[PDB]
Amino acid sequence: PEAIEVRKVPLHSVSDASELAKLIDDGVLEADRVIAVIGKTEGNGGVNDYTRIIADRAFREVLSAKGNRSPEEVAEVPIVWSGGTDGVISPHATIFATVPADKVTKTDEPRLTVGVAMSEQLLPEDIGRTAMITKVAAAVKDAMADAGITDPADVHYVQTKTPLLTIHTIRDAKSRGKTVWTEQTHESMDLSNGGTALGIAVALGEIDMPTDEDVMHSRELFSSVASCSSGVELDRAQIVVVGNARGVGGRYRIGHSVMKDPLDQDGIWAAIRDAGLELPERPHSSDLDGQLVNVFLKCEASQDGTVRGRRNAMLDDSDVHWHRQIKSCVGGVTAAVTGDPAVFVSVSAAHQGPEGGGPVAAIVDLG
Amino acid sequence: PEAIEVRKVPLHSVSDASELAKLIDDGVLEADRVIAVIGKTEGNGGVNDYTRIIADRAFREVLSAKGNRSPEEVAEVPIVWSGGTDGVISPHATIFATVPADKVTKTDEPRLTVGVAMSEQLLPEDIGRTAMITKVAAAVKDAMADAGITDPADVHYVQTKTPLLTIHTIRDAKSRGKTVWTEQTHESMDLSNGGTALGIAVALGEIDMPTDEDVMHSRELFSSVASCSSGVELDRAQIVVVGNARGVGGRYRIGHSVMKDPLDQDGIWAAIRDAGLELPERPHSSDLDGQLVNVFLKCEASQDGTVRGRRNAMLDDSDVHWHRQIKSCVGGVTAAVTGDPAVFVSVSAAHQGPEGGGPVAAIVDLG
Amino acid sequence: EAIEVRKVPLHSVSDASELAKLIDDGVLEADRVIAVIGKTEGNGGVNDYTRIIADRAFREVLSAKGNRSPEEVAEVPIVWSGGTDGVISPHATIFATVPADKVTKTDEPRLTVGVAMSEQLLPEDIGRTAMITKVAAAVKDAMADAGITDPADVHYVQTKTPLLTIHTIRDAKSRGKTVWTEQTHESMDLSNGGTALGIAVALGEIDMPTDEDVMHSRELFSSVASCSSGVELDRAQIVVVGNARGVGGRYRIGHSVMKDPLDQDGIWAAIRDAGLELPERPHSSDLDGQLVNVFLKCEASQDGTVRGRRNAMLDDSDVHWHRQIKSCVGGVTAAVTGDPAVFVSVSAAHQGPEGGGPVAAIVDLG
Amino acid sequence: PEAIEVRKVPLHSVSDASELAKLIDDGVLEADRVIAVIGKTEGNGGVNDYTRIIADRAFREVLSAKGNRSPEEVAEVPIVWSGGTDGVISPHATIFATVPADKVTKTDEPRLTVGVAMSEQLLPEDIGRTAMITKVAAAVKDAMADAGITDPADVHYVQTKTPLLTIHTIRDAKSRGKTVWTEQTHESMDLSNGGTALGIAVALGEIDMPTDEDVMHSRELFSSVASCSSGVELDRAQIVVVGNARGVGGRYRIGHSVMKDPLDQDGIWAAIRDAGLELPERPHSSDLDGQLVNVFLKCEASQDGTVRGRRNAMLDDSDVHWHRQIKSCVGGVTAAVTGDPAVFVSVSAAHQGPEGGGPVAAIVDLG
Ligand SMILES: NC(=O)CN(CC(=O)O)CC(=O)O
Ligand SMILES: NC(=O)CN(CC(=O)O)CC(=O)O
Ligand SMILES: [Cl-]
Ligand SMILES: [Cl-]
Ligand SMILES: [Cl-]
Ligand SMILES: [Cl-]
Ligand code: NA
Ligand code: NA
Ligand code: NA
Ligand code: NA
């Protein structure tokens, strides 16, 4: 594994990658050393969200223009866009790049490492079933090794992008005598993320191998580091593993915890603590002093329709889906911790953290 | 002035007032002494929000059934319903009732006092112009006297409910050859709140009497205690003035501060401090120990489209209006402070606190 | 019993004044009102509370102006289909019985109405055989109440059944029961679908289906079922409408099918079957006041196309296809009738063929 | 004037231009002879609709790839994307290309002619004011001359694409000490179309030059052929003038009429008649027999909130804006006439036909 440089840049428009271009010009990182991008785009966050492909193309063109890598090489860089920036959430991209050896001093302290992998092809009949779980788990171990990590406890954040079900793939499944878990395009999104999350939890040894009946139903089964996204651009699981390794060097370190509910700011502080920042007992955003790069977390409205004993009407709201409602709410909860509205807040959290909450990972600048 | 009993009760459904009925049966307060209700309803929060009148009638029926007051006496109790409970916000009602002097300890420490008034009828052509401002100012001054307050500095929170513009009233406006400030019903909600806020600010002597040119344009002109809501429940300004008075007694006290932006949790803590709660200097929701009755605050998306230097896309979002996005966001920010999703968070804050923020008032149980 | 049918506008969410005016003008008697079917201007989904507001305004007129007790009025089936996207005008169709001394009873087929309330439908019943069997029994009850023995004489069955809410899902699980789904919005389609199969069983259009058929076997459907769901009553509100000879009256009902959202000919066919003699290519101006209302279902097809052209309704996370296709068919329908007050209802599982729905028409013949 | 070839092709996805590529390969038309595109995209149709630029880029790249025209020449081809395909409306593009004289039959019958222009740059302070009106009028006169039309009566359809107001452009306006007609981005859509429509009406001599106070208020002033759309694709007015000329030849002819209200199917049939299709009285979609290329029309919710005496609640609906409601409704009304869900139905028709309705143009294949 290599030492990693991590930069979070704003998007000034749906098609803006100029801040990545500026980092390259200022020599903060090298175009060809960019190995992964994880960001938030200002689309609706649902099925018909096309701000993800716009941002995807704007960034790959900067990488192709400013580096010696060929456009075919750039296309292999995993870029994950979580649509939907309700409320104060600021569209942004977190850039992961390798550092040249002559810029790193390797320490025995744990420092940030990144691994990437692509699973075997996921067919429409795999989605949400043990076939998806097993294929994802193998890819997660692959990306884990690529990061130079052997201990699952050193994995703090796993970001994925998996296929959805469409009319075309559903027809494809049935034209070979296969079945699909569901035919609702919106619901397959939660299904794809859920099955992928269980895969992550298996590879990392957080749970025992579950059954087909567990997916979307056994919500006590979950991963504490899984952040799963789905879409249509790819028929494979794209895996990005972010963790720590000793003896690699670098300035950044990752840690994680869990949010037990949408208001659990202490869970976020716990992730920042676990990432290696020493903070006061009751910390405030002003205590961070520039040292928080970003946080990455999931959230969801709980099955019981309550938070801390108080009823809300999210699950009954046919006007604005609870996906967008809870995203905005936790966006404010999270940005109030970090002091920076540029936060990675993502919805659809089946088997991703405890029911009604989600995992939270934090990357900090330690030097 | 009279001692006030303040209770915050949940709404278990759109038409539920059972928790108010139970307070009356348990002798916590008397039906005939309820002088104002301020609550959050689970409607959409815009023009076609009819959960406001459903809750309005369900509560007025408990007051009429369980008290000796006539139904037209009850109809003059100002009941303000702020629709829209996006995110975790829990539908609830804050009930204000008078206590007989024989039951409160008349410390000369400042304790809660409440004043009520109804403006003249506000016609659709009045909305957003000097006619609305002058009518509201008169009602605010009357409600201030009704609270037994002479010094405007003792007013911490002015909650209003004013008519907005609908097709019907716009049609009514034109049926007399009269004009309306705007015919976009959704934006007339911001207009009605703004004109009412300026009314409050003049009555309290925070600003000089403004002109028609200033409404919605001179955003440096604002009140520091105005919380203005608009709706379809009544064609007059329902005024509730809440402040403190010495020598009145009671167990509750109000204070206020300002939120500089949607993430300004410290502004909320400042209001709770100003209300008279001793708190640690890095406070947490667990420090409140049941002593926070509720907080009442306004919020809005800033005109420059940024929070703390970070761009957001609220003002360009044609899918989910920024009213609902920022409400959900600030609901989470606020509920994380109080630890109680039952918070009064209201949107559209023209001339209500500084641009991009709003006032925040807090009522605490001191004993 | 001869039936009087009146369609009245709602001037606001809580307005029942036009029903009060019909009673005052002697057009019909409060206690003879036996069913109401209407459109309310709510969102048409789960959190639509304009249905109970209109429910309250109308029931208060009925018992205020009649000798019926508020407990009897509560037994009058009132069906509110929320969502009036586009030009659709909020309205109520009132069905009342006529006193014998005002009726000229003819052997020509004339309108008859039957009503029933099913057994209690619990959240675990929704979408399963328990819902199907309880609805079927109530439909047969309402059918007998209409004085109809032949199912072919039934042209229109309008229902209102509970959907699933967070409250009812909680109650189901607080008794150790399961629910077909926990997505409240999609439980609307489930409740309509299970109720439609119930209607289809009672009328002998299909054999009794299985739990696995609900929402999946879309070749199974009723040709007269119009099923709506909401949060107004925890039972199936049944209204059976058909024709009977020798009863008298001046209204007659007929029906046909809309094969897709644009099938205006299907609507004209229903008006024809109701007994209006119309030109080959009819226009709204040909109706000459004789169309009381039409009642129809619509839905977005699973294959995402209408007449070979793809649309993006099923992928739209911003505005649900329920509201999109309702507005679209509202325009298609109002263009036929010339009257934006049309009963257009969305979510048509097992209600007509896939991608379409039934359409019933009531006409004034004299 | 050149003879025109008109083809309507479906969009199989947001970024699909393959059907245009197929027309070029099959020799139906020449890449470099494509002079205008008018289409419907499956975005939300409001401010944050980015399916317009996605389709814009996909089409210009086919034009640049398959022709000898330079990319900056292609950029001057007016391509108008009307977002929002609510209901059955099918995403599609109508392609207008010139035909070499040697491929058409010279007839003295009126046949289709097309003219194009780009206006002077329109800044955010221009939108909705006399500056926009005068700039658009000049461009329309240029596009009319480019079509070889001298008599305004020969113009049947003027399609435009103009900038609307966003936070960015509003911030740009204020960063130079300028004002904007409004700061409600969603409302500026109606403003941009309205000001452009008055421009068209001036150039065509349908009205006298209006004042700033007339825009959005004097709805008796309107053009009978203007179809104005706004978005974020270009900061200038893209003008397409479509009419008929004698002695030019070609297969296609255009005509127009007016829709008085959303249900006025006869208005649509009248346009098809005027375009030169001999159809039966009481026509049906089955009478068209493949000869209707497309229809292009405007629609809007009337100011008085009624259609044919019946109240609707479109204008009070804060959940789904009346733009999307009436678009879906008229989409069904229109597609039922044509039998083809691929129809150009456009919303927001200020000064475009009479209030509550809009113009409707039809292009037919006559041979
Ligand atoms: N990719 C997903 O599963 C859910 N995504 C959907 C999207 O990005 O449009 C929303 C999110 O990540 O918060
Ligand atoms: N008319 C407009 O300005 C916007 N358009 C949609 C768009 O292109 O943004 C609405 C329509 O054409 O129906
Ligand atoms: Cl190296
Ligand atoms: Cl350590
Ligand atoms: Cl009798
Ligand atoms: Cl051909
Ligand atoms: Na979770
Ligand atoms: Na403010
Ligand atoms: Na159907
Ligand atoms: Na118009």
Query: Cβ(D185) to ligand 2 under 6 A?
Result: no
CATH 3.30.1330.160 in chain D, residue ranges? 251-367
D327 lines ligand 2 (CB under 6 A): yes
- By DSSP bridging, strand B292-299 and strand B344-347 are parallel
Q: Which residues pair with A6 in a beta bridge?
A: A96
**What 8-state DSSP symbol labels residue D91?**
P
Domain covering D106-250: architecture:
2-Layer Sandwich (3.30)
CA B258/CA B177 separation, integer angstroms: 41
Mutate to test the interface with C, among B13, B50, B86, B325 (most CBs of C within 10 A): B50
User: How many CB atoms are located within 10 Å of the residue D177 CB?
Assistant: 7
Superfamily of domain C250-366: Cyanuric acid hydrolase/Barbituras, RU C (3.30.1330.160)
Picking from A111, A109, A131, A110, the residue whose alpha carbon sits closest to that of residue A120 is A131
Closest atom of ligand 1 to A231 CA is 1
Does the active-site annotation cover C160? yes
In this structure, chain A runs to a length of: 367
Instruction: Give the whole-angstrom CA distance, residue C94 versus residue C71.
Output: 19
Nearest ligand to the CA atom of A299: 7
Q: Which method was it determined by? A: X-ray
C7 belongs to the catalytic site: no
Quote the CA–CA distance of A304 and B88 in Å, as a whole number.
12
Of D265, D261, D340, which is closest to residue C332 (Cα–Cα)? D265
Question: What is the distance between the terminal CA atoms of chain D, rounded to a whole angstrom?
Answer: 18
Question: Exposed, middle or buried by CB within 10 Å (0-12, 13-18, 19+), for C169?
Answer: buried
Ranges of CATH 3.30.1330.160 domains, chain C? 250-366
Q: What is residue B352's DSSP assignment?
A: B
Q: In chain C, what residues touch D338 (CB-CB under 8 Å)?
A: none
Nearest CA to B324 out of B295, B350, B346 is that of B346
Q: A170-174, long-range: CB within 8 Å, 24+ apart, which pairs?
A: A170/A124, A172/A123, A172/A124, A173/A123, A173/A124, A173/A125
Q: After which residue numbers is chain B interrupted with C–N beyond 2.5 angstroms?
A: none
A82 Cβ closer than 6 Å to some ligand 1 atom: yes
| Cα of D42 to nearest chain C Cα, Å | 7
Residue with CA at minimum distance from ligand 1 atom 4: A229
- Min CA distance, B124 vs chain A (Å)? 28
**Three-class secondary structure of residue A315 per DSSP:** helix
Q: Is D355 in the pocket of ligand 2 (CB under 6 A)?
A: no
Where in the sequence of chain A do the CATH 3.30.1330.180 domains occur? 106-250
Element (H, E) at C5: strand C3-9
**Cβ-count burial of C170 within 10 angstroms (0-12 exposed, 13-18 middle, 19+ buried)?**
middle
CB A160, CB A238: distance < 8 Å: yes
Distance of alpha carbon A313 from alpha carbon B165, whole angstroms: 27
Tokens of C87: 């030009």
Residues after which chain A has a gap (C–N > 2.5 Å):
none
Nearest to C35 by CA among C76, C92, C5: C76
CA A356 from chain centre, in angstroms, equals 18
- DSSP secondary structure string for all residues of C272-286: HHTT----SS--GGG
Query: CATH classification of D251-367 is 2.60.40.10, yes or no?
Result: no
Q: Which CATH architecture has domain C1-104?
A: 2-Layer Sandwich (3.30)
Domain B1-105: assigned CATH number: 3.30.1330.170
Q: Which long-range contacts (CB under 8 A, 24 or more apart) does C17-22 make?
A: C18/C92, C19/C58, C19/C61, C19/C62, C19/C92, C19/C94, C20/C61, C20/C65, C22/C94
- Residues with Cβ within 8 Å of residue A217, at least 6 apart in sequence: none
D61 close to A (CB below 8 A): no
A91 Cβ inside 6 Å of ligand 1: no
Task: Write the DSSP string, B75-140.
Answer: TTS-EEEEE---TTPPPEEEEEEEE-GGGS---SSEEEEEEEEEEEE--TTTTTSHHHHHHHHHHH
Resolution (A): 2.4
Rounded to whole angstroms, the Cα distance separating A336 from B114 reads 33
> If you ran DSSP here, which 8-state letter would residue D223 be given?
B
Amino acid at the residue C119: E
Alpha-carbon distances, residue C134 vs C30, C120, C176 (angstroms):
30, 8, 22
Pocket test for ligand 2, best of D229, D327, D351 (most atoms within 8 A of CB): D229
Q: Hey, CA dihedral for A22, A28, A30, A36, is it positive or negative?
A: negative
Assess contact for B55 and B232: CB atoms under 8 A. Answer: no
What is the Cα gyration radius of chain C?
A: 19
Place of tokens 């959303």: D262
Task: Give the C-alpha distances (Å, rounded to integers) separating A157 from A238, C336, D76.
Answer: 14, 58, 47
Cite the residue boundaries of each domain of chain C with CATH code 3.30.1330.170.
Answer: 1-104
Q: What's the order of all strands across the beta sheet hosting B358-365?
A: B252-259, B358-365, B292-299, B344-347
C-alpha dihedral, D303 to D306 to D312 to D313, nearest 10°: 20
Strand bridging mode A110-121 / A236-246: antiparallel
Q: Which of B40, B161, B257, B348 is catalytic?
A: B161
Question: Please, what's the b/e burial string for B27-62 (b: 16 or more CB within 10 A of its CB; e: otherwise)?
Answer: eebbbbbbbbbbbbbbbbbbbbbbbbbbbbbbbbeb
| Cα distance between residue B27 and residue B74, in whole Å | 19
B227 with B157: CB under 8 angstroms?
A: yes
| DSSP-based three-state secondary structure for C118 | strand
The residues with which C92 forms a beta bridge, in sequence order, are C8, C38
DSSP-derived letter for residue D133 is H
Contact C178, C264 (CB under 8 A): no
How far is it between the farthest Cα atoms of chain A?
60
| Side chain identity, residue A348 | S
Residue type (1 letter), C190: L
| Tokens (6 digits) for D188 | 């500026």
Q: Using a CB cutoff of 5 Å, list residues around ligand 7, an ion.
A: A 300, 349, 352-353, 358
- Tokens for C285, please give them: 């101006």
Beta carbons of D156 and D242 less than 8 angstroms apart: yes
**CATH of segment(s) C105-249:** 3.30.1330.180
Tokens representing C62? 């009925």
Cα B292 to Cα D339: distance, rounded to the nearest angstrom: 63
Tell how far the Cα of C104 is from the centroid of ligand 5, in angstroms: 13
Strand partners, C228: C160
Extract long-range pairs of B63-68: CB within 8 Å, 24+ residues apart: B63/B20, B63/B31, B63/B34, B66/B21, B66/B24, B66/B31, B67/B30, B67/B31, B67/B32, B67/B34, B68/B31, B68/B32
A325 in contact with B at a CB cutoff of 8 Å? Answer: yes
Q: Chain C contacts of D320, Cβ < 8 Å?
A: 43, 85, 319, 323
Q: What is the DSSP string of C232-281?
A: S-SEEEEEEEEEEETS--SEEEEEEEESSTT-HHHHHHHHHHTT----SS
User: Is B241 in contact with B147 (CB distance < 8 Å)?
Assistant: yes
Q: Residues of CATH 3.30.1330.180 domain(s) within chain C?
A: 105-249
Query: What are the backbone dihedrals phi and psi of residue C254, each rounded to the nearest 5 degrees, phi first?
Result: -145, 175
In order of D234, D256, D264, D273, the CA distances from D278 in angstroms are: 39, 15, 20, 6
